[PDB]
Structure formats: C-alpha cells, structure tokens
Amino acid sequence: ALRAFRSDPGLLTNTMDVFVKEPSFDWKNFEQKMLKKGGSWIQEINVAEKNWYPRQKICYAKRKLAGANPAVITCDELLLGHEKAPAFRDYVAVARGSKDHNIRAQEPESGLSEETQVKCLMDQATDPNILGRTWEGWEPWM
Amino acid sequence: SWVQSYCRLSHCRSRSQGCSEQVLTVLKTVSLLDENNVSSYLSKNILAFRDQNILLGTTYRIIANALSSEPACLAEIEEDKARRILELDSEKVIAGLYQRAFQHLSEAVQAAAGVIDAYMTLADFCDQQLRKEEEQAYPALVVEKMLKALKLNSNEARLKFPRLLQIIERYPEETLSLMTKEISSVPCWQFISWISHMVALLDKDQAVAVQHSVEEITDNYPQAIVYPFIISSESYSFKDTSTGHKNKEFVARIKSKLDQGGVIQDFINALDQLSNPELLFKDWSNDVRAELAKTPVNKKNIEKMYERMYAALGDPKAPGLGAFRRKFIQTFGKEFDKHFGKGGSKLLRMKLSDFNDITNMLLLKMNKDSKPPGNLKECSPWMSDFKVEFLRNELEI
C-alpha cells in the first residue's frame, strides 16, 4: 500500500492542504471539541493560537510521505508543541531509540526506501516501554 | 510507438529509482532520442508529435527535478555526457533545463482525450513551479489549459478546483476576468462535490467572479445547495465597500429564492427538537464560560447566546410558537418552571462568571426522572404523522 502511494505527483498533498486551510477549525473548533468532551485539556494554552501555521503541517506530511525516518518526524512533532516542557528529554529519549533494542536508532534519518520505512515503522509500532507507558484510556495491556 | 513505450517504461522506471541512478537511467533514453525518432515523420501526424513533445518535456523536467536535493556532486563521471548537458555554474544549466521543459511542453498546447494530457501536464508543471516560487505568466497559463480540460469530462481537472480557489486570491491581478470568461460556459454539475467551498466563498471578498454558476446550481438542482447555506449564512457578516453592497443583495436574493417550499426549515426544526436538552445545558454553560471568563466586553453576544438558550428550552410555550411542542418539553419546562423563572429573569445581564453549582445540582437531578429516549415517535410528534400530501417539491434525503 505504501509503495503504491509514494510514487505519485501529489494530488493527495494539495488536497490535504486545501483541507487544512479551511477557515472553520483554525484552533477555534478544535478548542471547542476539546472542551466539549473529557480529557485533560481544560486550560493553559497561550501558544496554541500560534504554531498552527499550515506550512508546518503540510511540510511535515510531505516529508513523512516523501521519505523520512518515523522517529525524526515524531521528534519534530513532539518538539514543536512541547518545547520548554518540564519533562522533555526523558520523553524524547524513550521515544527516540536505544541502538541495541530497536532498529530505528540504527538507520539513517532521511532519504530512505520503502521496505526499510515500513520495517522501522513496525519497529516503532511496538516497544515494552512505549506501550509500557501511555494514558490508560487507550488500554495498552490488550 | 516502440520508442514512446520505452520512454514510458523509463519514466515509470525512474519513479522507483534511488537518487543518483535517476539521471543515469534517463540520459540513455535521451541519447535514444538523440538518434532517429526525430527523423521527419512526426509532422504527418500532429497527435503523436504532441505526445513526443510531452515525453521530451517531462524527460527534461525529470532531469531538472533530479538535482533538487543534490547540487553538483551527481555531475561527476561525465565528459561527453557533460558535453551533451552543456549542449542545450550550477544555475545557468538548471534554468536552461527548466526553460527547455517550458518550451517543449508549451509546444504541445500550441499543437478524444488526446489533448487532456497536453493541458494537464503543463498545468501541473507550472503548478509545481509556483510551488517552488512560494518557498512570469504562471497564473495566466495554468487556468487556461486547466479549464480547457475541465470543460471536457474528467476527474483530474475536477480534483484541481481548490488550487484555482487559492490562486485567484493569491493572484488577483493575473487575469481575474479570464476565469470569469471561462466559467461562463461550463456544465455546472462538476462543482457539487466542491460546492461547500463555493457557498462560504461569497461571504468573503470577490464573489463577483463566480456567481453565475452558483445561480445556475440554485436554479437547476436546488436541493444540493441547501445544507451548506444554513451554516454559511448562520455566521455571515458583511462589509460596506462599493462592490460589497451588492453582495448582501445577492445573498439575500438567493436566500429568498431558496426554501421556496418553506418546509426544509421545518424538517430541520423537527430533527432538532428531539435531542437531549441537558446536553444543550452543558453546551450553554461551557460556551458561556468560554466567553464570559476572559472579560464581558462581548457586544450583544451574551444575549445572542441567551436567544438560543431561551428559544430551545425556555418558557414551555416558546417552542409552541417557534415550532411544534414535543411530549417531553411539556414535561421538561413544566418541571423547569422554577428552573427557568430565575433563569429567564436574572440570567440575561447578570455578569457573574463564576457560579454554576445550583445549576449543577439541578442538571444532575434533571437526568434522574427522565426517559430521553422517548420510547415512541411521538417524542417529536411532527414526523409521526407525515403522510406526504401534495405538490411541494419533496424532501429527497
């Protein structure tokens, strides 16, 4: 499926861009649907009015479809919404690699190929520590 | 046709290639083109000549698109091949490559469905050129061939609509009347999947380029314009510029033209008057805390929220005047007589912004003695006795 995807002129790219540039949900409807139901989002926003900036989202999606190690992409996505975090380097070290427990740490960071990409994704897909710690509503024990 | 199919295998072959091997696997095809499939027969037929122009242009664009992430180290083992590179300072050959691509791709549009390729390839090539520029006659050239393709029945031009939506706003000076003069003659049912863009187009600037086709869709297929319009005129403000004056005219005209049966609004009211009202209670409480806790300079917005808060679940005959009453708001407002007494009286302009705890205990007791599944259809008894009657241009779900 992924090999048949990423040999395309990019109709999916610009279609995704004109989805995300719709003047409906530019942080307003997202904060609406956040405050509606449960979770832990209640308050403490202050930077969420910025960082939306759809060149970020389309650039990251175009990189993660045009050849990208899926630990680098989730690193950028984790940093740009959680810079100056009180617990940050522990997060990025746990979800970065170990050089002896994962194959994703032992790989180049861009310009990859398809079988390598899906292999390191399936390696990224499971860990007794990543799945070992998440929010218990997601129920990782099953 | 043999050399054409071989170049097709080349382009699809380079599509799964790595990085440096791309230029190598296409230059041999270029040298095959340097031999004779140039030898004075692609003028007896113009169509295969045009496909030859398209394949030559996309070959040059693949050569140029190769060294986008690789500056000049790829051009390493090249002496006679470097001579052929320089035949037709790291920039002065790349721009010549792109310009030769523009030339041998514009020759195609200078020359069914043997022309949809020539239009669409030049369209996407100048599209990615403008996508390079945002990081000449580009909007003057994309819209011409794109709408010439969209006039014929196609999928790819139909999926190339919102790029035109953004290129018109981004380039207002680049032949704004041209897309109007081309949108004047299109079969106006190749927009219905995109029409939720066009309905919220008009409340912003420059609706005057496209109102012909919106008028035609509201004439011909009036059901397929309805549900975007309720939302896109629910929150629709206006500005008082000279061309902006007739925009409220045209939207009031289309507003008066639609719902001409005057029954779609009653259908929507019937569907609205069945839901959980305590859901609307927490909705009103949370989204008044979202707007009153910062500062109460919300000009008329507190009373505007109170308009909905009173229209749905207020005094129990206000739904009898706005719509037809249900069999459960006659329970709800009847128990909620004292709940909306001080509610409708002192909840207009109190500006308290902190207290909802008596509201909390009344909403939690409101969930106690109720069956909000109404157990029949008479929980909203407009629809239980439908029995469609006469000629009123029926609903068509």
Helix content of chain A: 40-55%
In N-to-C order, the SSE pattern of chain A is HHHHHHH
Beta-strand segment tally of chain A = 0
Shape of chain A: globular
For the largest beta-sheet of chain A, the strand count, sense and barrel status come to: none
What percentage of the residues of chain A does DSSP assign to strands (E)? under 5%
**Number of DSSP helical runs of chain A:** 7
Query: Rg of chain A to the nearest angstrom?
Result: 17 Å
Greatest contact between two chains: A-B, 13 and 16 residues
Question: Helix/strand-derived class of chain A?
Answer: mainly alpha
Indicate the multimeric state. part of a larger assembly
C-alpha termini separation of chain A? 26 Å
Structure description:
- This is part of a larger assembly, with 2 copies of chain A.
- By secondary structure, chain A is an all-alpha fold.
- In chain A, helix 2 runs antiparallel to helix 4.
- The longest helix of chain A has 12 residues.
- The radius of gyration of chain A is 17 Å and the shape is globular.
- Chains A and B meet through helix 2 and helix 3 of A and helix 8 and helix 15 of B.
